Symmetry: C4
Subunit: 91 residues, 4 copies
């Protein structure tokens, strides 16, 4: 259960470093510092305005931005679901 | 578990072909190419701006668009939930 | 499992009759016919733009609209969660 | 199961008192009265427009508002998930 929570933190930092690099210069309010990034990725992770509010405007500059965001969503939603059941089994 | 993941991909391509056909000419940024469709159907699948963002503007041209989108949502949300538990049982 | 699915349909029709009555005259695009209602309640049920997009504008006319929507959300989210596990137990 | 539901109500009132205090004077429509707060915290709890709708505009005045909202989200989403499974185990 704790191994999954650690794995998520590692994945979350790698993607926030990557996003900062790719979309920072073009989208500064969303991916400027690594701090702005980790916040935006959590927002995308909870699904809140992920497409109409972040991905669609980003794709208007980077047409393949979906190759980054869609897998990140599928991964973090699977990891969170796997982490959720870990607590369920332990009880 | 893998049989459900394959079934979802087949259903996702059939609906992405159908939407392209029905709402393509009228809503090109959302359903123009099959690719544009697959992206918008995933957005609808995650529930992100499905109604206010997509369905409501579409229904202003196609008043029965809800006959397509509502079942797609109920189906994909059931399939994902069934796929989620498949991994849980196997653990 | 089927008893819960029937219970939800009964609850969904009662609330769509009630909403049509309360907020129809003031909010016609959202609660005009019972048809417009059943669509909006499903949108609220999936959580899509429930507060900023429906409840907050409604409360600007009906300050207690939250007494209707919040319980409907808590009820339908519990019923769907109970219906979800029903399929899980049967497998 | 009932102990978790009581714990959530206590946590929801403490955060609703805190938010009222911190973001009340600056954001009155969202955190003016404790009542206005309890409604906005539930909206954030369901994830509806949490970031683009509330947190991002709040952070434009209080740059560290994320220290309050992100943990509240992680806590209430864990508590609700734990409360959900409590009913599942008892069945
Ligand atoms: C797992 C979730 C991790 C969340 C980390 C959030 C870190 C946020 C932060 O440190 N900010 C700087 C606070 O000084 C806010 C920025 O994200 C950004 O919103 C601003 O820079 C305005 O842009
Ligand atoms: C299951 C989810 C499938 C997702 C497929 C996305 C395909 C997106 C794509 O190929 N685009 C064209 C970029 O080459 C982006 C468009 O959707 C916009 O214009
Ligand atoms: C469980 C979910 C039940 C969903 C039922 C949807 C019924 C929708 C319907 O029959 N409409 C009339 C189609 O002619 C659409 C209206 O909801 C509304 O969007 C329009 O009247 C524009 O307003
Ligand atoms: C747990 C969820 C608690 C929800 C409490 C909602 C209280 C809402 C309320 O009393 N209002 C004043 C109407 O009397 C509406 C305001 O939130 C707006 O102005
Ligand atoms: Na959502």
């Amino acid at each position: 259960v704790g191994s999954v929570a650690a794995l998520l933190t590692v994945v979350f930092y790698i993607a926030a470093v990557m996003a900062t690099n790719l979309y920072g210069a073009t989208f500064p309010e969303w991916f400027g510092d690594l701090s702005k990034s980790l916040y935006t990725l959590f927002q995308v992770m909870t699904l809140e305005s992920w497409s109409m509010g972040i991905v669609r405007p980003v794709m208007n500059v980077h047409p393949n931005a979906w190759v980054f965001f869609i897998p990140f969503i599928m991964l973090t939603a699977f990891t969170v679901l796997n982490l959720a059941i870990g607590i369920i089994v332990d009880a």
